[PDB]
């Protein structure tokens, strides 16, 4: 029961309230790829040791001559970490007099405002974490502003690998490119163990997935099948799996021993420019599809995990030299009952210890 | 038309109409299974399609459905009959713009092939 | 037609993030409202009490933190004055600038006067 | 919401969030009524149809008139519901009462299937429908795009069934047990007031109901 | 005859592995019934309807 | 790659409806033991012989 | 060689789904029969007859 329009003396009804929460994506965060590695200091080091092998050259017996092998190579690297701080304040003049949306004549309290502010802060930090994880998956950790914090390829002295699927050409060998991507991980892992290249994640965008599932070779291959998989993929829901941040079921496609998942995650920064999670810095031709292939968790084993995220303490008066945390929230009151201050801190870095395994994928031809 | 000369159906029908425009006529409704490869992405044709010199084909229905369609969208007919009805259209003065084969799945006995026609 | 739009809420005075809190009003000035001029939260005011126009951003004086309605001589809290933060403080980057107003110039003037702007998210 | 930017730890800089926006909206509603009367002149001396010499009863006439009133209101309520599902809530007389698209300041979405084009992309349009369902709904919860009633008429249904992309795919689909959609009856579920089973088609995980 | 000869009707059953399709394309098609002169009336199934000659 | 791509082999296998046919074409392949770096090795079956990559 | 790859015979054996067609389309054609040199001699079944190379 609130004042009607046009007249302050007659009444109308206020049925309810509709809200438009922004879309948020958390696929990479929910994947569980980046194991948590709490940290005490502000920087962490790492030792890199490797050796090489060669073939013996035949040497004659009577002239007693031999061969030798080069010694090992040991290096060391260091990592800085990003600090995120976000401040929010509550004041009496945004509570006094202001009316609670969706209600006729009841007033906003401090509790609802505080709850909504904290929820927005936590959501912002979650989407920032997801964007950082995706950037680390790309192999280069670029901040939303654009500043470089850790270039994994130069740090480990490796070169990025990209594969051109050439989905436009009807005669393209999809099997050949899939096999190349599959064998690249096995060849460049160099962990000393036995690698299974079929255990990888291939995350592509909308255009790449559309061009892949509509290729004449793939469709003609799956149409001439009498298996339930082909029936589902051709005439059926292409949305198995999922539980994405927005959609309940992500698009995925089985062609070889690998799967292609379509990820639509995108965010905006303060400047207004959008940040598509599945993208290549530089490419924007609109008609080319891009993707990112990274090793599965169960490929190198749990003993050799390559996806870790660090956390170090905030610079507060009593948190020094302690284990890091996902997020710190602090309550500070303004003097003279003038309001309440909020601060949120998070000091993290996602990184990959084997950046060579992060393989890029494109839909155009080289 | 020599066997497996064209790497797909789209480039096969591009010079099948051109041959018909040049006065060459074909008839393979009796040995249809021996000349059509399965799947439209396979090299065309499976075996060499011989020419004929006694092409006298008068269908029982109006082959040009509209002025710009060989069949009503969704019409299914024998694959060998599609080529005859297409040949009937070029003979009578209709030109072929695009042959509809993008999403088709079957080539053997019955196929849902269509063509977009034009004057001259 | 089938679409009465009742209207939209005016911006709230939440741009204040930190100010030098004093027994009196530190970094807070009172302006006699300019006749037939409507003030809102975030507009930049001159010394006399008028909005900063193009070409004169060097004399920006304060940021209005009240919602003054010109048609009934009053504000949103029923106070018959216009209040803006002029001395040292920090505010959210939500500024209402007139046509042709250079944001960098007024930002530099306010920074020289002691006001800092925190980059607010979208 | 936006993306946080990295900040130097020692400098103690920070970020901030913009406030929200609030709007208000009003709706008028439509009022209609019907009047009927019973007089002891339609029950006096008139025989009950289908009987030889049986008079009609006041209770019978009362029940008949009440049932007719209730069913008239039911059918007009069904018509109004269907009108509301189309966005514009207009009367049978054609007077507009509520235009939701202008009211909420949104733009009507329309998917042009192009069923008359044999090389059209049905999957692309269905995916566009799902994407519009998922992205545009800003509820803030996890949403499923394949939870839509696609109610169509006989023309759209007939043109969609025999499209080369769908019909060829289902014909090539051997041993699917869903041969019924090609050979068997399509009256495979549902019921409106007058028809026992309504046409429905399964393709791409969505159901088209005529 | 014209109905069973139609290309759509024939194609709907040619590419089907149901025994009904086998019986209606190749088999007798004189399923059952007796009109008094012939031992079995010929019927056709194309959905919920049955065509009886 | 060129052997498994070849239209003759692909089309000869694209008709067979048997788990082997479903496995060679649009399948995992990679059916074999290790060589030292990969868990399984590409193996193609055709004509009674096995092509090992 | 000319007989086993003839389009009529090849497409008659491709369309049918029996272990025999799979055996003599994609599988080994050696079947049985010694030669004094060959351990198994090529055999092909099309009609009631069998062709031996």
Author numbering:
A (entry chain A): 2 to 367
B (entry chain S): 2 to 121
C (entry chain J): 4 to 125
D (entry chain F): 54 to 263
E (entry chain E), F (entry chain B), G (entry chain C): 211 to 263
Sentences from the paper on this structure:
Here, we report multiple high-resolution structures of the full Sf14 particle, including symmetric and asymmetric reconstructions of the virion capsid, empty capsid, portal region, tail, and baseplate. Sf14 virions have a spherical icosahedral capsid of 820 Å in diameter, which is connected to a long, contractile tail that is approximately 1205 Å long and an average of 235 Å in diameter, expanding to 315 Å at the baseplate. Overall, phage Sf14 appears to share some similarities to other model phages, but in different combinations: both λ- and T4-like decoration proteins, HK97-like capsid and portal proteins, T4/Mu-like tail fibers, a Mu-like baseplate, and a P2-like tail needle.
However, while many other T = 9 phages have one reported decoration protein, Sf14 appears to have two: one that is present as trimers surrounding each hexamer and a second that is at the center of each quasi 3-fold hexamer. The capsid structure was then resolved to a higher resolution of 3.2 Å via symmetric reconstruction. Each asymmetric subunit contains nine chains of capsid protein gp34, three trimers of decoration protein gp33, and one monomer of decoration protein gp20. The core of this domain is hydrophobic, while the external surface is enriched in charged and polar residues. The specificity of gp20 for quasi 3-fold hexamers could be due to differences at one of the three gp34 monomers.
